Structures are given as C-alpha cells and as structure tokens.
Amino acid sequence: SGFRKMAFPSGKVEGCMVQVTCGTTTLNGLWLDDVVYCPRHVICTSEDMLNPNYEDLLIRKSNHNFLVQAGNVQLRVIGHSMQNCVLKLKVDTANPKTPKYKFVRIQPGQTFSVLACYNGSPSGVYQCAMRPNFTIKGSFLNGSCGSVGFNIDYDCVSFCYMHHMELPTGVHAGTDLEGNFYGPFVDRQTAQAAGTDTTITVNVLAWLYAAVINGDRWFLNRFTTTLNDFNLVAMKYNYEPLTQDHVDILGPLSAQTGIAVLDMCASLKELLQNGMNGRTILGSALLEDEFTPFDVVRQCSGVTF
C-alpha cells in the first residue's frame, strides 16, 4: 500500500553526468559512449545570450576551450559540433558506465525523472510531467543547465529532456537530446513566457484509479457520462480533452478496479463542479496530474530496473 511520487532509480544516469566548462560558464553534460552532450549556450557569456549567433561563437572555440570533468578525471575533447540547441563534444574515452540508452522525444502529459545536477554532480532526483504548455515545473537553480530527464523501459534508459532555461514564472524549458526545444522557446535572453497551462486529464483519471486501488473510494458515484459530454466539461475547467486513445490506455485500470473509464469521468466531473468538500484523495486536496496510467500500473505492480 501507499502511493508516492516516485522517480526511476537514477544510478544509470548518475554514471553519465559530467561537468562542462567553457570560459567562465560551467554547466552539466551527459557523457554517453565518446560524446558529451550539453546545452549549446555553454559557449555564451551573458551579453552573447542577448542575441547569440551560435555558429559564429562556436567557430572561435578550439577543443581545448572545453574542459570536461568526469569525477576527478579530466576528459580530452577531440571534436565539437552542434545539433540544434545541443553541443556535442567528442571525447577520447568512451564512458565505461554507458548504459543501454536511446533518445526519445516525449509528448505533453508524459512523465519522466529529472536528475538535478550542479558541477557535474547529481544533487537530487524528482519526477516531472511535460506540461501541456511544454514547460516543466522543475526545481532548478543556477548551474543546473544540462541536467537530464529520463525514463527506464526494461533495462534501457530513454533520455527525453535536457535542461536549458528558467522562465519568469519559475517554470522550466529545455530540449530533447537532439536539441529540439519542447515548446515555443528559444535559447536567448529575450522576453519569453509560459503559455496558459491545462490539466492532464488522462493522468488525473489514472491517479483516481491509484486512489481506488489504495482504498480511497469516497469520490465514486453511480453515474457514467459520454466522452463528448465529459470533454464539454473538461474544456470548461481548463482540462485537456480526453481521447479514445486515453480511454483505451486506462482499460487495464478500469478492469482491475471495476470502474469504467467513463464511470471515473463522471467522478471527475463531479469533483470539478463541486470540489472535494473538505476531503482529500491520496493525501492531496488538488487533483494530481503528474502520474500517467503506466506510472500507476508500474507502481501498483512493483516493476524493477
């Protein structure tokens, strides 16, 4: 019993974290095989960030301008190239701790673990969701750039996020490991804002199933709804539309608890229109949306890595 916000075990990723320094700028890099990946803004000074020409700033750097430290060992940079907003530093040593990995681009609503790092040293691990507005509500201080987000699917680490920036509202923006930003963001010190966010409906439903599995049933009711009527309610409350794909994905949880997906939608509709009336669900007074249906099944079944 119990239901916690749980991250994947971070060990496989910890063995890949390195410190990357270029001039006065120091941030984190991800060392996989013979390449160290890091935000391309490591080559910028604060003035360069106002309007950077990354190709022009990079052509002025030699391999020796990049200092890569893995633990207490200095790696030798033997090449440097840019792919979108990520800088790739070829090093003379393949990381002996390189796990089985892949680079995956995730969709809004998908969750991942973040290994927050400073000076190439892991400091903490937390579970995030990619918001519908493409930001993450992370916890990052100055020096955290280059920290990565990941999932584990069997024994393979799927890297899905690299941290680049903090927006004025305190939320975060980054890229996939191919350097493509999530969201309409750019790696420049210019006015940028997170758009209006919405709640991840399929994740709220998954978390309501987790509550039922854990013995919290007060919010259940005799009613059901149509998918179209539920979406009319969900739109009114700044909830993401629930698709038939979402309904299908919730099938196993629906069969396990005996509550059809549209039966759980009727519970959620009532919660949106009436609130919780002083009650909590899994120790929360808000509807949690940072657990996917897969996270709920994984946590409730004890899948290991």
Interface contacts to its own copies, rule CB under 8 A: 1-12, 14-15, 115-119, 121-128, 137-141, 143-144, 166, 170-172, 214-215, 280, 283-286, 298-305
Q: Is 35 in the site for Cl ion (CB under 5 A)?
A: no
Which residue of the set 16, 38, 44, 145 is catalytic?
145
Pick one of 59, 73, 141, 191: the residue that binds ligand PQ6 (CB under 6 A).
141
Inter-CA distances, 159 with 9, 37, 104, 138, 226, Å: 14, 11, 6, 16, 37
Q: Is 41 in the site for ligand PQ6 (CB under 6 A)?
A: yes
Name the strand (E) or helix (H) holding 22.
Answer: strand 17-22
Q: Rounded to the nearest 5°, which phi and psi values hold at 138? A: -95, -170
Residue whose CB is less far from Cl ion, 152 or 266? 152
In whole angstroms, what is the distance from residue 90 CA to residue 77 CA? Answer: 6
15 binds, among ligand PQ6, Cl ion, its own copies, none (CB under 5 to 8 A by kind): its own copies
Residue whose CB is less far from its own copies, 153 or 248? 153
Residue whose CB is less far from Cl ion, 151 or 225? 151
Active site residue 164: no
Both tokens of residue 17? Answer: 């974290």
Q: Is 169 in the site for Cl ion (CB under 5 A)?
A: no
Residue 121 C-beta-side C-alpha neighbours within 13 Å: 4
Size of the site for ligand PQ6 (CB under 6 A): 14
- Among the candidate windows 58-66, 103-111, 181-189, 242-250, which touches Cl ion by CB under 5 A? 103-111
Q: Write the burial class of residue 278 (CB in 10 Å: 0-12 exposed, 13-18 middle, 19+ buried).
A: exposed
Residue whose CB is less far from Cl ion, 52 or 174? 174
Active site residue 145: yes
Neighbours of 104 (CB within 10 A): 19
Q: Is 127 in the site for ligand PQ6 (CB under 6 A)?
A: no
Inter-CA distances, 273 with 148, 267, 268, 285, Å: 38, 10, 9, 15
Name the strand (E) or helix (H) holding 29.
Answer: strand 25-32
9 binds, among ligand PQ6, Cl ion, its own copies, none (CB under 5 to 8 A by kind): its own copies
Residues that bind ligand PQ6 (CB under 6 A): 1, 41, 49, 140-142, 144-145, 164-166, 187-189
Q: Which residues are catalytic?
A: 41, 145
